[PDB]
Amino acid sequence: ATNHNLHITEKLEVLAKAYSVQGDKWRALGYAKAINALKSFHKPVTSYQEACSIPGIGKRMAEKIIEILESGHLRKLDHISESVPVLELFSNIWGAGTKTAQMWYQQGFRSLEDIRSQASLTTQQAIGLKHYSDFLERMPREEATEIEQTVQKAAQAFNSGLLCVACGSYRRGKATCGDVDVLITHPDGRSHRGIFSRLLDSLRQEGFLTDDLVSQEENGQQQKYLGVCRLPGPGRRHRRLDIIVVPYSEFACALLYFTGSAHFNRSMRALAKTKGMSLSEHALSTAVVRNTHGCKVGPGRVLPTPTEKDVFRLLGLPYREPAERDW
DNA sequence: CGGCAGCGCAC
DNA sequence: GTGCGC
DNA sequence: GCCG
Ligand SMILES: C[As](C)(=O)[O-]
Ligand SMILES: [Mg+2]
Ligand code: NA
Numbered sequence: 001a002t003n004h005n006l007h008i009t010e011k012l013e014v015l016a017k018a019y020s021v022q023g024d025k026w027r028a029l030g031y032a033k034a035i036n037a038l039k040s041f042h043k044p045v046t047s048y049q050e051a052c053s054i055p056g057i058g059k060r061m062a063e064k065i066i067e068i069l070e071s072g073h074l075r076k077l078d079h080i081s082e083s084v085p086v087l088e089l090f091s092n093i094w095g096a097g098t099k100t101a102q103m104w105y106q107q108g109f110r111s112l113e114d115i116r117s118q119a120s121l122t123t124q125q126a127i128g129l130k131h132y133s134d135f136l137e138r139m140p141r142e143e144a145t146e147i148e149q150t151v152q153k154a155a156q157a158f159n160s161g162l163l164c165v166a167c168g169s170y171r172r173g174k175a176t177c178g179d180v181d182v183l184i185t186h187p188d189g190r191s192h193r194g195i196f197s198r199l200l201d202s203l204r205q206e207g208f209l210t211d212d213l214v215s216q217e218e219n220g221q222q223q224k225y226l227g228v229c230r231l232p233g234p235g236r237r238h239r240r241l242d243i244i245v246v247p248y249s250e251f252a253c254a255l256l257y258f259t260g261s262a263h264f265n266r267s268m269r270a271l272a273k274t275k276g277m278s279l280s281e282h283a284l285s286t287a288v289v290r291n292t293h294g295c296k297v298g299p300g301r302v303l304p305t306p307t308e309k310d311v312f313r314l315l316g317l318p319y320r321e322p323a324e325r326d327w
Numbered sequence: 328c329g330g331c332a333g334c335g336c337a338c
Numbered sequence: 339g340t341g342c343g344c
Numbered sequence: 345g346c347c348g
Contacts (some may be wrong), residue, residue, distance in 0.1 A: 019345080029331065030345020058346055095337090097342050120336065124342085181344090215343090217335055224335090226344080242344080258344085269332055280333075281344085334344080336346085 004044040008065055009035050011074045015064075018080045021087040023098040034061045036263070036327055049081075083203035086110055094128030094135055094213065094240070110228065127211045131228060134237040138176035143239070145170075147233055151182045151243060154202045158195055162186050163251075167258035173323040181258050185251045196223040196245045203229070210238055220282055222246045222254065250282050254306045257281035264325040271315060277303070284311050 001008060016031035019211045037056040038045065045051050045234035046069070068074050083105050089112065092102035104119055115121070116129060128135065148166040155162050165171065167181045183281070184199075186192040211228035222244060229241040246254045257265055258281070265279075272279040276287045277300070284305050289298035305311045312319045 016345090024345085026331065027345045030347095033331095033346070056346065095342070099341060122342095124337070213343090214336055219334060219344095224344080226336090260344095262344090266331075273332095278332080287348070328348100330348095336342090336344105338340085 001040055003039040005041065008068045009038050011068050011077060012327045015076055018084050021084060021098060028240065072232055092136060093125055093132060095122055095124035095147060101261050124213050127213060131238045135240055138238055139177050141170065141177060144177045144180050147180045147229060147239060148182055149206055150231065155184055155195065155199050158198060159191055161191065167255065168260060169257045171322045172325055181242040183254055183258055184245045185248050187248055189248045192245050192247060200225055252308050252311055253283050254281055256308050256311055259322050259325065261326055263327045275315060284314055
């Protein structure tokens with residue numbers, strides 16, 4: 001689906017990014033939705049009225065869209081803080097968001113070297129810093145595959161019936177991936193237990209895992225590892241690797257959630273809500289019970305979903321292949 | 328206007 | 339509790 | 345930022 005409003009979506013992507021790095025995440029969200037629409041519009045935008053007919057574009061966005069169309073420029077871009085470029089540089093560090101970026105900028109830091117030399121860093125940020133270049137580049141789809149295989153082989157050594165699948169952008173079919181998320185479960189419903197720990201162990205012993213960002217995260221019955229790996233071989237880069245072990249009963253929803261994209265998940269939650277349901281990485285459930293004051297005082301009932309299709313079906317939706325989940 | 332999900336971790 | 343990424 |  002070619003974009004017929006490039007010079008517009010280009011200038012808008014700059015302003016969006018600017019708001020994002022300065023902390024205005026919600027406004028950044030709005031821009032990103034509007035920018036998507038502009039790209040997937042069935043043709044070029046020629047009027048303010050036309051612009052306003054596209055869901056996701058309101059008066060203010062139309063206003064900007066038309067300014068670029070007619071004038072070829074966007075004044076707003078000229079008044080963007082000079083700090084932006086640096087705030088982005090600092091936030092490209094895994095573990096450092098806008099607040100940390102702003103703090104470092106206020107302390108007079110300007111380069112990655114200043115950070116490395118005078119900045120106070122958290123354990124995660126330090127790891128993020130030494131792997132700045134590596135974590136910045138998207139890896140070839142092929143390397144993501146090898147990483148998944150490495151995890152799978154080591155997991156199946158403990159139990160051959162385990163099911164492993166790489167999610168994220170990789171499962172959505174992208175040529176390159178910024179990271180790998182390996183979701184692991186077992187069809188029998190309980191043999192996935194007591195796998196997480198010895199698996200990370202096995203992978204560390206063989207030198208595959210080089211750094212831990214979060215060694216273990218317990219979310220209900222889901223165990224998640226956020227770390228860094230590097231395949232054997234000279235010239236291999238370090239890569240962001242996540243490992244998630246979940247009970248089979250939550251495999252579908254976990255698969256759906258970690259395959260994303262983040263915009264897709266967002267739309268699915270919104271839709272669940274309209275049907276009186278909630279969708280999480282754990283399950284599709286009826287909405288929670290709330291008292292007169294309108295406050296969660298009783299979880300909803302989980303609606304069993306063996307496969308992703310079951311989730312789409314219960315939401316009265318046509319199944320969407322992973323490759324079609326960018327938005 | 329409030330919602331745009333809500334979680335667990337490191338600090 | 340806040341900041342961050344999932 | 346947009347939406348209801
Ligand atoms: C101000 As309005 C069109 O978002 O209700
Ligand atoms: Mg507001
Ligand atoms: Na960051």
